Coordinates of C-alpha atoms in Angstrom, one line a residue:
Chain A
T1 CA -22.2 -3.1 -27.1
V2 CA -20.2 -2.3 -30.0
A3 CA -22.4 0.8 -31.6
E4 CA -20.4 3.4 -31.6
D5 CA -22.1 7.0 -32.8
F6 CA -22.1 7.8 -36.8
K7 CA -19.0 10.3 -36.4
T8 CA -17.1 8.0 -35.6
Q9 CA -18.5 4.8 -37.0
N10 CA -20.6 5.1 -40.5
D11 CA -24.3 3.2 -38.6
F12 CA -23.6 0.2 -40.4
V13 CA -24.3 -1.9 -37.0
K14 CA -27.8 -0.5 -37.1
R15 CA -28.0 -1.7 -40.7
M16 CA -26.4 -5.7 -38.8
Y17 CA -29.3 -5.1 -35.9
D18 CA -31.9 -4.7 -38.3
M19 CA -30.9 -7.8 -40.6
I20 CA -30.3 -10.4 -38.1
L21 CA -33.0 -9.4 -36.3
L22 CA -35.5 -10.3 -39.5
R23 CA -34.1 -13.5 -40.5
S24 CA -35.3 -14.9 -36.9
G25 CA -38.8 -12.8 -36.6
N26 CA -39.7 -13.5 -33.7
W27 CA -39.5 -11.5 -30.2
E28 CA -37.3 -14.2 -29.3
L29 CA -34.3 -12.3 -29.5
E30 CA -35.2 -8.1 -28.2
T31 CA -37.1 -10.7 -24.1
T32 CA -33.9 -12.3 -22.8
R33 CA -31.8 -10.8 -20.0
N34 CA -28.3 -11.1 -19.9
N35 CA -26.3 -11.5 -16.1
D36 CA -28.6 -7.9 -14.9
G37 CA -31.5 -8.8 -16.3
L38 CA -31.4 -6.3 -19.3
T39 CA -32.8 -6.5 -23.1
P40 CA -31.2 -5.6 -26.0
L41 CA -33.6 -2.3 -24.6
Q42 CA -32.3 -1.1 -21.3
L43 CA -29.0 -2.2 -22.6
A44 CA -29.7 0.4 -25.1
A45 CA -30.7 2.5 -22.9
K46 CA -28.3 2.1 -19.5
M47 CA -24.8 2.0 -21.9
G48 CA -25.7 6.2 -23.4
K49 CA -26.5 4.3 -27.4
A50 CA -28.0 7.1 -28.8
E51 CA -28.9 6.1 -32.2
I52 CA -29.9 2.7 -31.8
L53 CA -32.3 3.3 -29.8
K54 CA -34.1 5.5 -32.3
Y55 CA -34.4 2.5 -34.2
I56 CA -35.6 1.3 -31.6
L57 CA -38.2 2.9 -30.5
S58 CA -40.1 3.9 -34.2
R59 CA -38.6 0.8 -36.4
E60 CA -41.3 0.8 -38.6
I61 CA -42.2 -2.9 -40.8
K62 CA -43.5 -2.6 -44.4
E63 CA -43.2 -6.3 -45.5
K64 CA -46.2 -8.8 -44.8
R65 CA -45.4 -11.7 -42.9
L66 CA -43.2 -9.9 -40.4
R67 CA -45.5 -6.7 -39.7
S68 CA -45.9 -8.0 -35.9
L69 CA -42.2 -7.0 -35.5
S70 CA -42.3 -3.6 -35.3
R71 CA -43.0 -0.7 -32.5
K72 CA -44.9 2.1 -34.6
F73 CA -47.4 0.9 -36.9
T74 CA -48.9 4.1 -39.2
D75 CA -52.8 3.8 -39.5
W76 CA -54.8 6.7 -40.3
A77 CA -53.4 8.3 -43.2
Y78 CA -55.4 10.1 -45.7
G79 CA -52.8 12.7 -47.6
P80 CA -50.3 14.7 -46.4
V81 CA -51.4 14.0 -43.3
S82 CA -51.6 10.9 -40.8
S83 CA -51.6 9.8 -37.7
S84 CA -48.6 7.1 -36.5
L85 CA -49.4 4.9 -33.7
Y86 CA -45.8 4.4 -31.3
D87 CA -45.8 1.1 -28.4
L88 CA -45.6 2.0 -25.2
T89 CA -45.1 -1.6 -23.4
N90 CA -41.6 -1.3 -22.7
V91 CA -41.1 2.6 -21.8
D92 CA -43.8 3.4 -19.7
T93 CA -42.3 3.1 -16.0
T94 CA -44.9 0.5 -15.9
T95 CA -41.9 -2.1 -14.8
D96 CA -39.3 -3.2 -12.6
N97 CA -37.4 -1.0 -14.5
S98 CA -38.9 0.3 -18.2
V99 CA -36.4 2.7 -21.1
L100 CA -37.7 6.0 -19.7
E101 CA -37.0 5.4 -15.7
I102 CA -33.3 4.6 -16.7
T103 CA -33.2 7.2 -19.3
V104 CA -33.7 10.2 -16.7
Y105 CA -31.7 8.9 -13.3
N106 CA -28.4 7.3 -15.3
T107 CA -25.9 9.8 -14.1
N108 CA -22.9 8.3 -15.8
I109 CA -23.3 9.2 -19.3
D110 CA -23.7 13.0 -20.4
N111 CA -25.6 12.2 -23.6
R112 CA -29.0 12.2 -22.0
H113 CA -29.1 15.5 -24.8
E114 CA -30.7 13.4 -27.5
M115 CA -31.9 10.7 -25.9
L116 CA -34.8 12.8 -24.1
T117 CA -35.8 14.2 -27.4
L118 CA -36.5 10.7 -28.6
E119 CA -39.6 9.4 -30.5
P120 CA -42.8 8.6 -27.9
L121 CA -40.3 10.1 -24.9
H122 CA -40.6 13.3 -25.1
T123 CA -44.3 12.5 -25.9
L124 CA -44.8 10.6 -22.6
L125 CA -43.2 13.4 -21.2
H126 CA -45.5 16.3 -21.9
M127 CA -48.7 14.2 -21.4
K128 CA -47.7 13.6 -17.5
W129 CA -46.4 16.6 -17.2
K130 CA -49.7 18.5 -18.0
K131 CA -51.7 15.7 -16.7
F132 CA -50.4 16.0 -13.0
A133 CA -47.3 17.4 -12.8
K134 CA -48.5 20.8 -13.0
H135 CA -50.9 21.5 -10.6
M136 CA -48.4 18.9 -7.9
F137 CA -45.4 21.3 -8.8
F138 CA -47.3 24.6 -8.1
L139 CA -48.8 22.9 -4.9
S140 CA -46.1 22.3 -3.6
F141 CA -45.4 25.9 -4.2
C142 CA -48.2 26.6 -2.6
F143 CA -46.8 25.3 0.8
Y144 CA -43.7 26.4 0.4
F145 CA -44.4 29.7 0.1
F146 CA -46.7 30.1 3.1
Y147 CA -44.5 28.1 5.2
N148 CA -42.1 30.4 4.6
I149 CA -44.5 33.4 5.3
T150 CA -45.2 32.0 8.6
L151 CA -41.9 31.7 9.6
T152 CA -40.5 35.5 8.1
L153 CA -43.7 37.0 10.6
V154 CA -43.2 34.3 13.8
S155 CA -40.1 35.2 14.0
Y156 CA -39.9 39.2 12.7
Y157 CA -43.1 39.6 15.7
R158 CA -40.0 37.8 18.1
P159 CA -41.6 38.6 21.5
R160 CA -38.5 41.8 23.1
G161 CA -54.1 32.1 21.4
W162 CA -56.6 30.6 18.6
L163 CA -54.8 31.2 15.6
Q164 CA -50.9 31.8 16.3
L165 CA -51.1 28.0 18.0
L166 CA -51.9 27.0 14.1
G167 CA -49.0 28.6 12.7
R168 CA -46.5 27.0 15.3
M169 CA -47.6 23.7 14.5
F170 CA -47.6 24.1 10.7
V171 CA -43.9 25.0 10.5
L172 CA -43.3 22.3 13.3
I173 CA -44.6 19.4 11.5
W174 CA -43.4 21.2 7.7
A175 CA -40.4 21.1 8.6
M176 CA -40.6 18.1 10.0
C177 CA -42.5 16.1 6.9
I178 CA -39.3 18.1 4.9
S179 CA -36.4 16.8 6.9
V180 CA -38.0 13.4 6.7
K181 CA -38.7 13.4 2.9
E182 CA -34.6 14.8 2.4
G183 CA -33.6 12.3 4.4
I184 CA -35.5 9.3 2.3
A185 CA -34.1 11.1 -0.8
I186 CA -30.6 11.8 0.4
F187 CA -29.5 8.7 0.5
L188 CA -30.0 7.0 -2.9
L189 CA -27.1 9.4 -4.2
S190 CA -24.2 18.8 -9.3
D191 CA -27.4 17.6 -9.9
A192 CA -29.6 16.9 -6.6
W193 CA -27.4 19.4 -3.4
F194 CA -30.7 21.3 -3.6
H195 CA -32.0 18.4 -1.6
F196 CA -28.9 19.3 0.6
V197 CA -30.1 22.7 1.2
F198 CA -33.7 21.7 2.3
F199 CA -32.2 19.9 4.7
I200 CA -30.6 22.4 6.7
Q201 CA -33.2 25.0 6.3
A202 CA -35.0 22.5 8.4
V203 CA -32.7 21.1 10.9
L204 CA -32.7 25.0 11.4
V205 CA -36.2 25.6 12.1
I206 CA -36.9 22.5 14.0
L207 CA -33.2 22.8 15.7
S208 CA -34.4 26.7 16.9
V209 CA -37.5 25.7 18.2
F210 CA -36.3 23.1 19.9
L211 CA -34.0 25.3 22.1
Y212 CA -37.1 27.7 22.2
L213 CA -39.0 25.2 23.7
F214 CA -36.1 24.8 26.3
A215 CA -34.4 27.9 28.4
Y216 CA -32.3 29.1 25.9
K217 CA -32.2 32.6 24.1
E218 CA -29.9 31.1 21.5
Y219 CA -32.4 29.9 19.4
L220 CA -32.8 33.9 17.2
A221 CA -29.6 33.2 15.1
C222 CA -31.3 29.3 14.0
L223 CA -34.1 31.2 13.2
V224 CA -33.6 33.8 10.9
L225 CA -31.0 32.6 9.0
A226 CA -33.5 29.2 8.5
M227 CA -35.5 32.4 7.7
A228 CA -33.0 33.7 5.8
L229 CA -31.4 30.3 3.6
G230 CA -35.7 29.5 2.8
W231 CA -36.1 32.8 0.5
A232 CA -32.8 32.5 -1.3
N233 CA -34.3 29.1 -1.5
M234 CA -37.3 29.8 -3.1
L235 CA -34.9 29.8 -6.2
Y236 CA -36.1 26.2 -6.8
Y237 CA -38.8 26.9 -7.5
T238 CA -38.9 28.7 -10.2
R239 CA -38.1 26.2 -12.4
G240 CA -41.4 25.2 -13.4
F241 CA -41.1 28.3 -16.0
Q242 CA -39.4 28.0 -19.3
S243 CA -38.6 30.5 -19.6
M244 CA -37.6 31.7 -15.8
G245 CA -36.2 27.6 -15.3
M246 CA -33.4 28.8 -18.4
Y247 CA -32.7 31.6 -15.5
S248 CA -32.1 29.6 -13.2
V249 CA -29.8 27.3 -14.6
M250 CA -27.4 30.2 -16.4
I251 CA -27.7 31.8 -12.3
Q252 CA -26.1 27.7 -11.1
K253 CA -24.3 27.4 -14.6
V254 CA -21.9 30.3 -13.9
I255 CA -21.9 30.1 -10.0
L256 CA -20.3 27.3 -10.9
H257 CA -17.7 28.9 -14.4
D258 CA -16.3 32.0 -12.5
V259 CA -17.2 32.9 -9.5
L260 CA -15.2 30.0 -7.7
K261 CA -12.3 30.9 -9.3
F262 CA -13.0 35.3 -8.7
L263 CA -13.6 34.7 -5.6
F264 CA -10.7 32.7 -4.7
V265 CA -8.2 34.6 -5.9
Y266 CA -9.9 38.0 -4.5
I267 CA -9.5 36.3 -1.2
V268 CA -6.1 35.8 -1.0
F269 CA -5.8 40.0 -2.6
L270 CA -7.4 40.5 0.4
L271 CA -6.0 39.3 2.8
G272 CA -2.0 39.6 1.8
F273 CA -2.4 43.1 1.7
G274 CA -4.9 43.4 4.7
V275 CA -1.7 42.0 6.6
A276 CA 0.5 43.9 5.0
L277 CA -1.0 47.4 5.8
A278 CA -2.1 46.7 9.3
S279 CA 1.3 45.6 9.9
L280 CA 2.1 48.4 8.4
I281 CA 0.8 50.7 11.3
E282 CA 2.3 52.5 14.5
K283 CA -0.5 52.3 17.4
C284 CA -0.1 55.6 19.1
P285 CA -1.7 56.7 22.0
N286 CA -7.0 55.5 23.8
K287 CA -7.8 57.8 21.0
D288 CA -7.1 56.0 18.1
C289 CA -4.9 57.9 15.0
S290 CA -5.7 56.1 12.1
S291 CA -8.5 53.1 10.8
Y292 CA -6.6 50.3 9.2
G293 CA -5.6 49.2 13.3
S294 CA -5.7 45.6 14.0
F295 CA -5.9 42.8 10.9
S296 CA -10.0 42.8 11.2
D297 CA -10.3 46.2 10.6
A298 CA -7.6 46.8 7.8
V299 CA -9.6 43.8 5.4
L300 CA -12.6 45.3 6.7
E301 CA -11.3 49.6 5.2
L302 CA -10.2 46.6 1.9
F303 CA -13.8 45.2 1.0
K304 CA -15.5 48.6 1.7
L305 CA -13.4 50.1 -0.5
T306 CA -14.2 47.1 -2.9
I307 CA -17.7 48.4 -3.6
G308 CA -16.7 51.2 -3.2
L309 CA -18.3 52.7 0.2
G310 CA -15.9 53.7 2.0
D311 CA -13.1 57.0 2.2
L312 CA -9.0 56.8 1.1
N313 CA -7.6 59.6 3.9
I314 CA -3.6 59.2 3.7
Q315 CA -3.1 60.4 6.8
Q316 CA -3.1 57.2 9.0
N317 CA -0.9 57.6 10.9
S318 CA 1.8 55.2 9.4
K319 CA 5.4 55.8 9.5
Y320 CA 6.1 55.0 5.4
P321 CA 3.4 57.3 4.1
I322 CA 4.5 57.2 1.0
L323 CA 4.5 53.6 0.9
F324 CA 1.3 53.0 2.3
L325 CA -0.3 54.9 -0.7
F326 CA 1.3 52.9 -3.1
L327 CA 0.2 49.4 -1.9
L328 CA -3.1 51.2 -1.4
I329 CA -3.4 51.9 -5.1
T330 CA -2.3 48.8 -6.2
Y331 CA -4.9 47.3 -4.9
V332 CA -7.9 48.9 -6.4
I333 CA -5.6 48.7 -9.6
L334 CA -5.0 45.0 -9.4
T335 CA -8.8 44.4 -8.1
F336 CA -11.6 47.2 -9.3
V337 CA -9.9 47.3 -12.9
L338 CA -8.6 44.1 -14.0
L339 CA -10.4 40.8 -12.4
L340 CA -14.1 42.4 -12.6
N341 CA -14.0 43.2 -16.0
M342 CA -12.0 40.4 -16.7
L343 CA -14.9 38.0 -15.2
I344 CA -17.3 40.5 -16.9
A345 CA -16.1 39.4 -20.6
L346 CA -15.4 35.1 -19.5
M347 CA -18.5 35.8 -18.6
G348 CA -19.5 37.1 -22.0
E349 CA -17.6 33.8 -23.1
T350 CA -19.6 31.7 -21.6
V351 CA -23.3 33.0 -21.6
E352 CA -23.0 33.2 -25.9
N353 CA -21.8 27.8 -25.3
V354 CA -24.2 28.3 -21.9
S355 CA -27.4 29.9 -24.1
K356 CA -27.8 26.8 -26.7
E357 CA -27.7 24.1 -23.8
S358 CA -30.2 25.5 -20.8
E359 CA -33.2 23.8 -22.9
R360 CA -32.2 20.9 -22.5
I361 CA -31.2 21.0 -19.0
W362 CA -33.4 22.0 -17.3
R363 CA -35.5 20.0 -20.0
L364 CA -33.6 16.8 -18.0
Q365 CA -34.3 18.1 -14.9
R366 CA -37.8 19.0 -15.2
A367 CA -37.8 15.4 -16.0
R368 CA -36.5 14.1 -13.0
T369 CA -39.2 16.4 -11.2
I370 CA -42.1 14.4 -13.3
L371 CA -40.7 11.7 -12.9
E372 CA -40.1 12.1 -8.9
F373 CA -43.8 13.0 -8.4
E374 CA -44.9 10.3 -10.3
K375 CA -44.3 8.1 -7.4
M376 CA -46.0 9.6 -5.0
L377 CA -49.6 8.8 -5.9
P378 CA -51.2 5.2 -4.4
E379 CA -51.8 2.7 -6.8
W380 CA -54.8 3.8 -7.8
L381 CA -54.7 6.8 -9.6
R382 CA -51.3 5.1 -11.1
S383 CA -53.4 2.6 -12.7
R384 CA -56.5 5.7 -12.7
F385 CA -53.9 7.7 -15.5
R386 CA -52.4 5.1 -17.3
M387 CA -52.2 7.1 -20.4
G388 CA -52.5 6.2 -23.8
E389 CA -55.1 3.3 -25.0
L390 CA -54.7 -0.1 -26.6
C391 CA -54.8 -1.0 -30.2
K392 CA -55.4 -4.7 -31.1
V393 CA -51.8 -4.3 -34.4
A394 CA -52.1 -7.9 -35.1
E395 CA -54.0 -11.2 -35.6
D396 CA -54.2 -11.3 -31.8
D397 CA -51.2 -8.5 -30.2
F398 CA -53.3 -5.3 -27.9
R399 CA -50.7 -3.6 -27.0
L400 CA -50.9 -0.4 -25.4
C401 CA -49.8 3.1 -27.9
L402 CA -49.8 6.3 -27.7
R403 CA -51.3 8.6 -31.1
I404 CA -48.7 11.4 -32.2
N405 CA -50.5 12.5 -35.5
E406 CA -48.0 13.5 -38.3
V407 CA -48.1 16.2 -41.8
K408 CA -45.3 16.1 -44.4
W409 CA -45.6 17.8 -48.0
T410 CA -42.5 15.9 -49.4
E411 CA -42.6 12.1 -49.5
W412 CA -45.7 11.6 -51.7
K413 CA -46.6 8.0 -51.4
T414 CA -49.7 6.2 -52.6
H415 CA -50.5 3.9 -48.9
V416 CA -50.8 0.7 -48.5
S417 CA -49.9 -0.3 -44.7
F418 CA -52.6 0.7 -42.0
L419 CA -55.1 -0.8 -39.7
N420 CA -58.3 1.3 -39.9
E421 CA -59.0 1.6 -43.8
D422 CA -61.6 5.1 -43.1
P423 CA -59.5 7.9 -41.3
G424 CA -61.1 9.1 -38.0
Chain B
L1 CA -54.0 63.3 -14.5
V2 CA -54.0 66.8 -16.1
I3 CA -57.2 67.4 -16.6
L4 CA -58.1 65.5 -12.3
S5 CA -55.3 68.1 -11.7
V6 CA -56.4 71.6 -12.8
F7 CA -60.1 70.4 -11.5
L8 CA -59.4 69.8 -8.2
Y9 CA -57.1 73.0 -8.5
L10 CA -60.6 74.6 -9.5
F11 CA -62.1 73.5 -6.2
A12 CA -60.7 74.5 -2.6
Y13 CA -58.3 72.4 -2.1
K14 CA -54.3 72.0 -2.1
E15 CA -53.9 68.1 -3.0
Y16 CA -53.2 68.9 -6.6
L17 CA -49.6 68.9 -6.8
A18 CA -49.1 65.7 -7.0
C19 CA -51.0 65.0 -9.7
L20 CA -49.3 68.1 -11.6
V21 CA -45.9 66.3 -10.7
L22 CA -46.4 63.0 -11.8
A23 CA -47.7 63.4 -14.7
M24 CA -45.0 66.6 -15.9
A25 CA -42.7 63.8 -14.6
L26 CA -44.4 61.0 -16.7
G27 CA -44.6 63.4 -20.0
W28 CA -40.6 64.2 -20.0
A29 CA -40.3 60.1 -19.3
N30 CA -42.9 59.5 -22.4
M31 CA -40.8 62.3 -25.0
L32 CA -39.3 58.7 -26.0
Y33 CA -42.4 58.2 -27.8
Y34 CA -41.7 60.2 -30.5
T35 CA -37.4 59.7 -31.3
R36 CA -39.3 56.8 -33.6
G37 CA -38.9 59.2 -36.8
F38 CA -35.6 59.0 -37.3
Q39 CA -34.1 55.7 -37.8
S40 CA -31.5 54.8 -35.9
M41 CA -33.4 57.2 -32.9
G42 CA -36.3 54.3 -33.8
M43 CA -34.4 51.2 -33.8
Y44 CA -32.7 52.7 -29.9
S45 CA -36.3 53.7 -28.2
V46 CA -37.2 49.6 -30.2
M47 CA -34.4 47.6 -28.4
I48 CA -35.0 50.3 -25.0
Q49 CA -38.1 48.0 -24.7
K50 CA -37.0 45.1 -26.2
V51 CA -35.0 44.8 -23.3
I52 CA -37.2 46.6 -20.6
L53 CA -38.9 43.1 -21.3
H54 CA -36.8 40.7 -21.7
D55 CA -34.7 41.3 -18.9
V56 CA -34.9 43.7 -16.7
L57 CA -38.4 42.4 -15.3
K58 CA -36.8 38.9 -14.3
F59 CA -33.7 40.6 -12.2
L60 CA -35.6 43.3 -10.6
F61 CA -38.7 40.3 -9.5
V62 CA -36.0 38.1 -7.9
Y63 CA -33.5 41.4 -6.6
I64 CA -37.1 43.0 -4.6
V65 CA -37.3 38.8 -3.7
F66 CA -33.8 38.8 -2.2
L67 CA -33.5 43.2 -0.9
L68 CA -37.2 42.4 1.1
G69 CA -36.1 39.0 2.5
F70 CA -32.8 40.2 3.7
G71 CA -34.5 43.4 4.8
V72 CA -37.2 41.6 7.1
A73 CA -34.0 39.8 8.1
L74 CA -31.5 41.9 9.0
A75 CA -34.5 44.0 10.9
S76 CA -34.8 41.2 13.1
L77 CA -32.0 40.6 13.8
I78 CA -31.7 44.4 16.1
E79 CA -31.8 45.0 19.6
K80 CA -34.5 47.9 20.2
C81 CA -32.5 50.3 21.8
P82 CA -34.4 52.7 24.6
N83 CA -30.5 56.6 22.7
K84 CA -32.2 56.8 19.6
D85 CA -28.7 57.3 17.6
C86 CA -28.0 54.0 18.5
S87 CA -28.3 51.5 15.3
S88 CA -29.4 52.5 12.1
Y89 CA -31.4 49.4 10.8
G90 CA -34.4 50.0 13.4
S91 CA -37.9 48.9 11.6
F92 CA -38.4 47.8 8.7
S93 CA -38.2 50.6 6.0
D94 CA -34.8 51.5 7.9
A95 CA -33.2 48.2 7.1
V96 CA -34.7 47.4 3.5
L97 CA -34.3 51.5 2.5
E98 CA -29.9 50.6 4.2
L99 CA -29.6 47.6 1.8
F100 CA -31.2 49.9 -1.1
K101 CA -28.5 52.8 -0.6
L102 CA -25.7 49.7 0.0
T103 CA -26.5 48.4 -3.8
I104 CA -26.1 51.4 -5.7
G105 CA -23.5 51.6 -3.4
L106 CA -24.2 55.9 -2.0
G107 CA -24.3 54.4 2.1
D108 CA -22.0 53.1 4.5
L109 CA -21.2 49.9 6.0
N110 CA -20.4 50.0 9.2
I111 CA -20.8 46.7 11.7
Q112 CA -20.8 48.1 15.5
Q113 CA -24.8 47.9 15.1
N114 CA -26.1 47.6 18.7
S115 CA -27.3 43.6 17.9
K116 CA -27.0 41.0 19.4
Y117 CA -25.0 38.7 17.0
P118 CA -22.3 40.9 14.8
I119 CA -20.7 38.5 13.7
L120 CA -25.0 36.9 12.0
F121 CA -25.3 40.4 11.0
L122 CA -21.6 40.6 8.8
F123 CA -22.4 37.1 7.6
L124 CA -26.3 38.5 5.5
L125 CA -24.8 41.9 4.8
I126 CA -22.2 40.3 3.3
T127 CA -23.7 37.7 1.6
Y128 CA -26.7 40.4 0.9
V129 CA -24.2 42.1 -0.8
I130 CA -22.0 39.4 -3.1
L131 CA -25.6 37.6 -4.2
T132 CA -26.4 41.2 -6.0
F133 CA -23.8 43.0 -7.1
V134 CA -21.1 40.0 -8.0
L135 CA -23.7 37.4 -9.1
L136 CA -26.8 39.5 -10.8
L137 CA -25.7 42.7 -12.2
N138 CA -22.9 40.0 -13.8
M139 CA -25.0 38.3 -15.3
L140 CA -27.3 39.9 -16.3
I141 CA -25.4 42.0 -18.3
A142 CA -23.8 38.5 -19.5
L143 CA -27.4 38.5 -20.8
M144 CA -28.1 41.5 -22.3
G145 CA -24.8 41.5 -23.8
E146 CA -26.7 38.0 -25.8
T147 CA -29.7 39.3 -26.6
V148 CA -28.6 43.0 -28.7
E149 CA -26.4 40.2 -30.8
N150 CA -29.8 38.8 -31.9
Chain C
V1 CA -8.1 34.1 -27.0
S2 CA -10.0 31.4 -25.6
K3 CA -8.6 29.5 -27.9
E4 CA -4.9 29.1 -27.9
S5 CA -5.9 29.9 -24.6
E6 CA -5.1 25.8 -24.3
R7 CA -2.8 25.8 -26.6
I8 CA -0.3 28.3 -24.6
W9 CA -1.0 26.7 -21.3
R10 CA 0.2 23.7 -22.8
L11 CA 3.1 24.8 -23.8
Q12 CA 4.0 26.4 -20.7
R13 CA 3.6 23.6 -18.6
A14 CA 6.2 21.7 -21.4
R15 CA 8.0 23.9 -20.5
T16 CA 7.9 23.0 -17.3
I17 CA 8.1 20.0 -16.8
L18 CA 11.8 19.9 -19.1
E19 CA 13.1 22.7 -16.7
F20 CA 12.3 20.1 -13.7
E21 CA 13.2 17.2 -15.6
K22 CA 17.1 18.8 -15.3
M23 CA 17.0 19.0 -11.5
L24 CA 17.0 14.6 -11.0
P25 CA 20.0 13.6 -10.8
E26 CA 22.0 10.8 -13.7
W27 CA 20.4 7.7 -11.9
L28 CA 16.8 9.4 -11.3
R29 CA 16.9 10.3 -14.6
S30 CA 18.6 6.2 -15.7
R31 CA 15.9 5.3 -13.5
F32 CA 12.4 6.5 -15.1
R33 CA 13.4 6.1 -18.9
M34 CA 10.3 5.9 -20.8
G35 CA 9.2 3.3 -23.2
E36 CA 10.8 -0.4 -23.3
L37 CA 12.9 -1.9 -26.0
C38 CA 11.8 -4.1 -28.6
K39 CA 12.9 -5.6 -31.6
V40 CA 12.9 -4.9 -35.1
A41 CA 14.1 -6.3 -37.7
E42 CA 16.8 -8.2 -37.7
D43 CA 18.5 -7.3 -35.1
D44 CA 17.7 -3.3 -34.8
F45 CA 16.6 -3.4 -30.6
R46 CA 15.4 -0.1 -30.6
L47 CA 13.5 2.2 -27.6
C48 CA 9.7 2.5 -28.5
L49 CA 6.5 4.0 -26.6
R50 CA 3.9 1.9 -27.6
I51 CA 0.5 3.4 -28.0
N52 CA -3.2 1.8 -28.7
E53 CA -6.4 2.9 -31.1
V54 CA -9.1 2.6 -32.7
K55 CA -10.5 3.3 -36.0
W56 CA -13.3 1.1 -37.5
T57 CA -13.9 3.1 -40.5
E58 CA -10.4 2.0 -42.5
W59 CA -11.2 -2.2 -42.9
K60 CA -7.2 -3.7 -44.8
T61 CA -6.7 -7.2 -44.4
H62 CA -3.4 -7.3 -41.9
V63 CA 0.0 -8.4 -43.3
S64 CA 2.6 -6.1 -41.1
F65 CA 2.7 -6.8 -37.7
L66 CA 5.9 -8.0 -35.4
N67 CA 3.6 -10.3 -32.7
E68 CA 1.4 -12.4 -34.4
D69 CA -1.0 -13.2 -31.6
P70 CA -2.5 -10.2 -30.0
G71 CA -1.5 -9.6 -26.2

């Protein structure tokens, strides 16, 4: 609880940890639980302590009598190549609250940049991913893509069978399933707004089909809104590819950083000058002799002239046409020359600072996804995968382990500590 | 393409013009390989190719997704009027074309489009304009600002 | 500019704070009165403003302090 960092503590707590642990050699101290049911390992994981965690997860003891106190045993070394054998007794999501699940689902530290790159956590995530999360992710993406194409076709070919009924039941049952899953996962809380988007889209589809089975024709609104939301929603399944994952993450980072401020300011300007111009217009008689008539038309003409489509004329039936021209020219200046270029420069500043953390945030999101998938499987499959294999470590220890080979050409030493003599 | 066109021309065919003009345009766009003899121009062509590899492909994938999605949406929202100059978002082709024009800033954005839910029409069009024009173009410009420095 | 934006903004907010502090009447300003007295020496009684701190590098035996038992 007291260990802070290196830049502000000079790393003296790790050493006291090691000394106190060795001076009483047994698992008596690293197994007890405080009044929350946490051990010093899970307690270092709940808080953001990322230096003591890196120490504890890979702790190698070279003495003879206290070797059973370690968590990484070199067991194969020959030359510069060697094969360390980590330990996975409380790090592999097979108990109540492991260190992997605690590290990933913790949303109150903001230091998960450095805690999901440590020694066994990194390779555990990578192995889980390339073992089953690849398959399950691509399968779910394919299901979603076909659901959305069926939706798009049934909407476009609307009226104004052996196969069609199948498509309709498919859309209905998959909307029901997605809504159920999102309602389940939503009660447990940025980071997870895509649950909200999925839920809104599913609710729109099911509400539309309900209103269609009734005596209503106002279902088209919900249907097309749901369709457009799905096509704009595929950007969540674009996180399976590293390059594309970083792409989507920086898109969201941008929309959070800048476009919101810019849109607030710009809407203020648009509405203000809209009411001004629409007030300066004097009604003339039956036969509109101007464009900026009501307030709606004024705001619309300003929007068009912003995105560069309209036509700027001056004979606008006003009473003070020079003032009209001054207001229009100053609005064009204010937005087009100033705000767009300023925001482009700002988003030039953000990108130079985000690209270095894009990989980290993407990696953390992929970890969330992997651990989310691992819970859908039933019992026997999870017992079937079971990363890592046993390894007799001492007189009678038999701890699960995860082998990680390594090559180091700088620290030459005579090898004394190893489990198996002849390397394999 | 050139040799196939001249073969089909020496025959009893008139569909050679397609192959001929396609080959012509491909040659003029192909001169960029002979622009590598000059150090400055060589670096220029190399960074052009690096750019088209890095970014324009991702951006084009995403943008085509958006364009086709909103195209089918708008083309579905439109009622079939029997005064064919009544609405401009008619078939699917016309819808996707109007969206493309309004992206490169040539068209004209009008609202009286013979729809049945014109506020919804306006909301979809404004959201498409936002999504591309304010977001993706500027984001890609910043990214290609990042690539060039590297 | 982004590196001096915070500085210039902070200076502007300081201007605003001190501009507002002059609109209030006398009794309100006497009512807020940041900081509280603290007998510092034989008879000093100077106003003061407490600022706690934590430092994990300069270890030293503490000799100089006003109140013995920390509160």
